[PDB]
Amino acid sequence: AKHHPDLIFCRKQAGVAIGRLCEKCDGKCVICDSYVRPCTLVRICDECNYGSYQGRCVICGGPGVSDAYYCKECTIQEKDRDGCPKIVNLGSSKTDLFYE
Amino acid sequence: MTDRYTIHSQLEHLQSKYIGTGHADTTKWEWLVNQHRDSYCSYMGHFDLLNYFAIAENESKARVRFNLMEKMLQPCGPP
Amino acid sequence: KEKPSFELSGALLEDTNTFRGVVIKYSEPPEARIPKKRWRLYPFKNDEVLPVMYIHRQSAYLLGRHRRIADIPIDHPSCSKQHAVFQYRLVEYTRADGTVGRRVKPYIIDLGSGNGTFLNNKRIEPQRYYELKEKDVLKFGFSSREYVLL
Amino acid sequence: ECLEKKVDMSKVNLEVIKPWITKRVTEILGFEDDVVIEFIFNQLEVKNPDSKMMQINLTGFLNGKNAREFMGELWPLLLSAQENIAGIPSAFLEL
Amino acid sequence: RLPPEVNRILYIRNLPYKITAEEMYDIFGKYGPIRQIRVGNTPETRGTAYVVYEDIFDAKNACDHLSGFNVCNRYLVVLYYNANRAFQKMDTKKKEEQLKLLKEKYGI
Amino acid sequence: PFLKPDDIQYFDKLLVDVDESEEQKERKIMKLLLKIKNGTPPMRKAALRQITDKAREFGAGPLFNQILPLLMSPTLEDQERHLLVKVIDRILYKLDDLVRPYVHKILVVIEPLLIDEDYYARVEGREIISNLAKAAGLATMISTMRPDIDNMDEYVRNTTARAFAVVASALGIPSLLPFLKAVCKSKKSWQARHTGIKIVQQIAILMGCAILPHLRSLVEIIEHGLVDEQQKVRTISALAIAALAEAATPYGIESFDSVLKPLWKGIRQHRGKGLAAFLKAIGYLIPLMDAEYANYYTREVMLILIREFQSPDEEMKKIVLKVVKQCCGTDGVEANYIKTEILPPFFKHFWQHRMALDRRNYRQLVDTTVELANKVGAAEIISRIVDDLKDEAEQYRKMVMETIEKIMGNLGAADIDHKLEEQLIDGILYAFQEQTTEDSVMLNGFGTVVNALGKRVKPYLPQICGTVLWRLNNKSAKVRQQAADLISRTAVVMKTCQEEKLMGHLGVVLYEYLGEEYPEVLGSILGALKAIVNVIGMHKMTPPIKDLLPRLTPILKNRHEKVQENCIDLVGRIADRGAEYVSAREWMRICFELLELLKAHKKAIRRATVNTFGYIAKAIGPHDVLATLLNNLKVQERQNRVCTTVAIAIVAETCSPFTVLPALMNEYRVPELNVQNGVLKSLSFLFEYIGEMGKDYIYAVTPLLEDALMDRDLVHRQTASAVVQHMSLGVYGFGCEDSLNHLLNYVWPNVFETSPHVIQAVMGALEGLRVAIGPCRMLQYCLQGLFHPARKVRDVYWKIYNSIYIGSQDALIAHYPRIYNDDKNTYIRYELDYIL
RNA sequence: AUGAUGUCAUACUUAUCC
């Protein structure tokens, strides 16, 4: 996204697990990364939500509280009918911040 | 049988997985064959277009559908 | 078949105290210090003090019947390799005035000899803080000795 | 090369190919190991094996010269076993 | 009765560029037999040396007495060298011949 | 930048000043490493890039030759390590065929990253080995890594196993299968088979849920080790079955099928660790069986499970613990049997102060106990563990406390009787009164307990809140924040039961602490006030808002991360809800104070800030406040500005922008550039929020976009293009396309550039323009560019044409022009020329 | 009179981040 450009999404097969968002990343969109116009809920992959991988945030990856949703601008642009956008990789973010 | 050609991966990049997207180094015949296959798939998918195509010809709907499915593989020949 | 026990192995104890050719037992505590009092080893084997060894100049002193472990041999065939260990260390005691502090005094404790030891014709047990002073009639052997140190 | 003809391991035996593969592995790698025998067992476990994948797995296993000869010797013996109506190579008819 | 980190190798520094291995062997030769000694002949490492003895306690008495010991105008830097890794510049090999020998001679 | 006294050995070659006379100059210039290792952060950045682009130049050989010693250094840092890992990655995104000789020479240093105490180190390591294996060839990896299988040390064998796990995740299971399946049947020595089996396991952990397709073949491999004469192979084998089944989500049961009958038999005869391992496997298996077969088999396992509670082995206790979870958490098991046989020994041996001090044992214990509650019911478990709330040690109290928490979370408090409830509330207060550390467990615990009890808690309030005030003094630093938060979470309960005196208490009492100088306390105080606002309404506030709000206003200077947070939040709640109680003058002062809150380093602060600014924008009306936004100096380049832009958007929503636009559009005139691109952004977010309503204002913005899109400097084209995007999605289908075509003209030249933000911007632009205008016009701009053999135009126009192609591929058919047929091929589609 | 590369400041973006 606009904050992390080197992050890669999962884009796996869509399952029946509804996605969730963390308390620090509440209200933020997954594709458009906006805060207004939520139109479609976020669905997670089957391998992305299993055991300890269930109930976690898609973007933040922390403890999910509320369910995540997609932006209406991404819904009208057909950017929400793609695969599961689970953040798998984590590069150049929250790595040197742990040392300080 | 040394081939020295292992199109496996590099750095989790590119790796085309879709069909009909195309590349910058795509040839003209490959793009024409992909456009013809997309046109055949759109003719097979749309019911009104298939009805308008079968009403003009003297053939039936299922025969024209089987002819369009049989002509999908190798429509031109040289890619 | 592998016989795992998860007990105290001897290699971790031998790597901590490693001598030249043998194991090193009878280690001193962390409260050891250099002695500054007027005390010298006066050995009298035949009522004549030929040798004299300074105990306050060295930190460790090992006497035995082996020439590879010890530095200087001793002419005592009735004494074992590890019979007695006289080491000076400042222990917790009280002076004559009543104030507490560090006093350099020799520590006397038996190391578990096979025949024991005797001092002033009396046997002393280990793990007991005895009042050790100068000019004591000790014995540097397991059974008996014809030489005393002062 | 010799790895372009389609073959099938279901029409050939497996017990007669173990000694020739063991001799080829002892000639290539010098000694006897357990990873190369397991790789040769896994390469013939499928009913329709892949000659190019086996050559890549054994094409670099050695140095890149004895493995090509080993693949060319294993493809011809398997071809002679699959072409025969019995299902055995030429080295098993004499002994 | 020794700290584990100390090793038979000692890194020694604050050396002159003219210094002679005669003085080296003489001085360091007090504590025990020299396993061997290296000296930097290279632009950065000139002025430095490594000493290795047949025994560790040799080196222990060395750094004991040689601590801040003097040569010319200089007080040498005497430290216990840290060779945790083998720089892998060299390899692990050539075990086969010697092990075959001990398996041959003594037969064990 | 400086050299540590040891690093000289590595960098000595740089010290000598001999200069300017081949490869020796490449090693000499390669000391840019030193700039990466030690130096200022900018030196590290610029150095890092410079060495990235020189990869293809220098080659992998010199680099690794000059790196691997450093990453091998005995004195290596944490950071320095991580940084050298970074350079290895970034250079391995480029070099592909080159690394083949160095692969092992890499892994030897890298495999120690896989086994490490640091987690981020592990995910990094797995990542870079993934990039290496995928980067190199399969046969490269395989042929490389064989000799480490039989290596004497087991360390290299283990970390090597995890290596094969990573590479197998890279290149997939089926490609690597025959290798493994060959390994586990190796007849030389056992150590190999041990390794390969461990590989099966680590594949199970890593791949996890995705093992599913090849599960059968994998099992067929591993099965032959269970009966082997050696022990290890048996143990690690059955363990690997465990890992499989655990990643084996409720299915593939019959694939494990042939494995069972030996296992059960082994369950009889084994002493020691292998036994426990089998119990681990069988444990994860049982949920995958049928409640009939698993009835029998389970009832058999229960015996040994009982007998084996008492072993001192902690591995044992872990296993048998999780087992008890799965076996006794089975729907096909009877309550009373557990209640009698299990619970008394369970709470006897398992609940002790050996366990709780450990971490994993703590958690797993919590879970298992939770599930036993899930079956036998609530009052049992809780009733037995309540008495331990009053136990001395903390960690133990913490344990039973969170246990009670989860229990009453799931089952509900309805089952609980009266007396045990007295012991409950007293237990929870007592435990809460002694807190050595600050943590949520006690608090969330209390809150969940009370909210679960509902109004059965009412007789207990005065004791609660008495404790709440007295503690609300004691120690402000430590406990003030905590008692405050306690109020915050107990608000609703202190409300619905209709104790009004208590709301007077908390209202003015908390009101008084707003002068507290310690921020970490004050924050919790404001939070408590917040929660009290959400229960009792505006006009009923015992501290009437006229009092409260201006008393809040000065606090905004407070810098503090928690004060600012809760404060701005509360100003938001009151500013949104009542908003009449306070006169406008106070409000506009609040504005001029809010303006500099946008220096916050936190995103949520700015969030609440902007939303509030919208609320008060409603309380007053647009013109003044949007003017106060346009006052902004823009002074900070890295953001700190565009939040004001967002405020301009939301303000333009809160009352109709149908009013506001002329002021803004006029304010583009100003010669100061960064605020020009600022108001461009304001249009962008503006259309993003307004959506449909842009069916009118498109025209108004059109010529200005003309002026902006015509380039003064790149940011104009970029931001303006984003505006075209959001406008283009918003207006869709309403018939305004014409002017959007006109704007598309000026959009079109910007197609060419290498700047990432402008090219991705333009991409979004032309995508929105695709949907709005329709593909036909797009394609009519994208035709001629395809052809171009020039290494640029074709790259781009094919990128575009792909973007147009993926979506709306169905509707493109009509618009492909007529293309004449050549010799070998017929390029005319005659179907469209059939005429009735 | 564009363009070329290179030492070297200066603004801007990524809702970048303790």
PDB file of N, CA and C (backbone and C1' of nucleotides) in Angstrom, chain A residues 94-100, chain F residues 79, chain G residues 17-18:
ATOM      1  N   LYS A  94       8.607  -2.556  11.064  1.00  0.00           N
ATOM      2  CA  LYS A  94       8.637  -3.114  12.420  1.00  0.00           C
ATOM      3  C   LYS A  94       9.819  -4.052  12.646  1.00  0.00           C
ATOM      4  N   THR A  95      10.956  -3.777  12.006  1.00  0.00           N
ATOM      5  CA  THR A  95      12.164  -4.572  12.175  1.00  0.00           C
ATOM      6  C   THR A  95      13.242  -3.818  12.935  1.00  0.00           C
ATOM      7  N   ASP A  96      13.592  -2.611  12.487  1.00  0.00           N
ATOM      8  CA  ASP A  96      14.530  -1.784  13.236  1.00  0.00           C
ATOM      9  C   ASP A  96      13.854  -1.063  14.393  1.00  0.00           C
ATOM     10  N   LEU A  97      12.519  -0.994  14.393  1.00  0.00           N
ATOM     11  CA  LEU A  97      11.807  -0.351  15.489  1.00  0.00           C
ATOM     12  C   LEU A  97      11.832  -1.204  16.753  1.00  0.00           C
ATOM     13  N   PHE A  98      12.020  -2.518  16.609  1.00  0.00           N
ATOM     14  CA  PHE A  98      12.140  -3.380  17.778  1.00  0.00           C
ATOM     15  C   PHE A  98      13.468  -3.170  18.493  1.00  0.00           C
ATOM     16  N   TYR A  99      14.509  -2.768  17.762  1.00  0.00           N
ATOM     17  CA  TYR A  99      15.808  -2.519  18.370  1.00  0.00           C
ATOM     18  C   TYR A  99      15.846  -1.216  19.160  1.00  0.00           C
ATOM     19  N   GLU A 100      14.975  -0.264  18.843  1.00  0.00           N
ATOM     20  CA  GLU A 100      14.932   0.999  19.564  1.00  0.00           C
ATOM     21  C   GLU A 100      13.723   1.052  20.492  1.00  0.00           C
TER      22      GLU A 100
ATOM     23  N   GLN F  79      22.095  -6.010  15.419  1.00  0.00           N
ATOM     24  CA  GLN F  79      21.826  -5.184  14.250  1.00  0.00           C
ATOM     25  C   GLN F  79      22.731  -5.546  13.079  1.00  0.00           C
TER      26      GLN F  79
ATOM     27  P     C G  17       2.910   4.410   9.988  1.00  0.00           P
ATOM     28  O5'   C G  17       4.198   4.021  10.840  1.00  0.00           O
ATOM     29  C5'   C G  17       4.627   2.670  10.931  1.00  0.00           C
ATOM     30  C4'   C G  17       5.946   2.558  11.650  1.00  0.00           C
ATOM     31  C3'   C G  17       5.989   3.144  13.050  1.00  0.00           C
ATOM     32  O3'   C G  17       5.453   2.274  14.033  1.00  0.00           O
ATOM     33  C1'   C G  17       7.877   3.875  11.834  1.00  0.00           C
ATOM     34  P     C G  18       5.169   2.803  15.523  1.00  0.00           P
ATOM     35  O5'   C G  18       6.353   2.182  16.387  1.00  0.00           O
ATOM     36  C5'   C G  18       6.433   2.415  17.789  1.00  0.00           C
ATOM     37  C4'   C G  18       7.811   2.120  18.326  1.00  0.00           C
ATOM     38  C3'   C G  18       8.042   2.529  19.779  1.00  0.00           C
ATOM     39  O3'   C G  18       8.939   1.613  20.405  1.00  0.00           O
ATOM     40  C1'   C G  18       9.545   3.702  18.384  1.00  0.00           C
TER      41        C G  18
END
